[PDB]
Design a binder for this molecule. Structure first.
Ligand code: HEM
Length: 213
C-alpha cells in the first residue's frame, strides 16, 4: 500500500479529534479573537521554524529529499511577515513561546537530528493540512477578524508559488510514494504522524486554557 494512503488512513481518526478540540471548534464557528489568533500563529512560527531547520539539515538525505520543496511550501518567511503584522516591528521579543510549543519543537529536533526517516510524518501532518483544510480556515479567519483579501496578516495561509493546491498535493503524495519504504519505516512513519497530530491537539488544548484563565 502506498505511503500517502497509509498516512491518510492512519491519521483520519486523530484528525477528527483535532478538528473538535475546543479551540478549533470555536475557530471553525468563526469565534476566533485576535488574542487567540496571535497565540496560535506565534506558536506555528516556532513550529515551522524548527520543522524547516530540520528539513534543511536533511535536504540531501534520501529518506526525505524527494519531499524537498522549499519555494512552494516553506512557511517561515510568511510567518515572519505575519508576526510583523500582528505583533509589530519588535515581534521577536513580543511573541510567546509556550511549553506545548516547546514540546512540539523538541520532538521536531529529535526527529530531524536522530530519526530523519520519520521527518516525512511531520511534513505531511503540517503541509498537507495547510494545503487542504488550512484554506477553509483562512476564509473563516478573514471573515471573523475583518482581514483584507489582499492577504496581510494571513501570509501563512497563502502559497504564491503554488498555482493549484489540489494538483500540488497530488504531486507531493506521488513523490512521497517514491521514498524507499520498508515495513519498519512505513509503520513508524504512520505512528509518528499520529504523534504529530497529538502534539497539535496538545497545543490547541494549552492555548484554549491560556485564553480561558
Ligand atoms: C477545525 C480544524 C480543521 C478543519 C476544519 C480541517 C479540515 C480539513 C479538510 C476539509 C481536509 C481535506 C480532507 C480531504 O481532502 O478529504 C483536511 C485534510 C488534512 N488535514 Fe485538516 N482540518 C482541520 C485541522 C487539522 C489539524 C489540526 C491538522 C494537523 C495538525 C490537520 C491536518 C490535515 C492533513 C495532514 C490533511 C491531509 C489528509 C490527506 O489527504 O492525507 N487538519 N483537513
Amino acid at each position: 500500500q502506498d505511503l500517502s494512503e497509509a498516512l491518510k488512513e492512519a491519521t483520519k481518526e486523530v484528525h477528527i479529534r483535532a478538528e473538535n478540540s475546543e479551540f478549533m471548534r470555536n475557530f471553525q464557528k468563526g469565534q476566533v479573537s485576535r488574542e487567540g489568533f496571535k497565540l496560535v500563529m506565534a506558536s506555528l512560527y516556532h513550529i515551522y521554524t524548527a520543522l524547516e531547520e530540520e528539513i534543511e539539515r536533511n535536504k540531501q538525505n534520501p529518506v526525505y529529499a524527494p519531499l524537498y520543496f522549499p519555494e512552494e511550501l516553506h512557511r517561515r518567511a510568511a510567518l515572519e511577515q505575519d508576526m510583523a503584522f500582528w505583533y509589530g516591528p519588535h515581534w521577536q521579543e513580543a511573541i510567546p513561546y509556550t511549553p506545548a510549543t516547546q514540546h512540539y519543537v523538541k520532538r521536531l529536533h529529535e526527529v530531524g537530528g536522530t530519526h530523519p526517516e520519520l521527518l516525512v510524518a511531520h511534513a505531511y501532518t503540517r503541509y498537507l493540512g495547510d494545503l487542504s483544510g488550512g484554506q477553509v480556515l483562512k476564509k473563516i479567519a478573514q471573515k471573523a477578524m475583518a482581514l483584507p483579501s489582499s492577504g496581510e496578516g494571513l501570509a501563512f495561509f497563502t502559497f504564491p508559488s503554488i498555482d493549484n493546491p489540489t494538483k500540488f498535493k497530488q504531486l507531493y503524495r506521488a513523490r512521497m510514494n517514491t521514498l524507499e519504504m520498508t515495513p519498519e519505516v512505513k509503520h513508524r512513519v504512520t505512528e509518528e504522524a499520529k504523534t504529530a497530530f497529538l502534539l497539535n491537539i496538545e497545543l490547541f488544548e494549552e492555548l484554549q486554557a491560556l485564553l480561558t484563565e
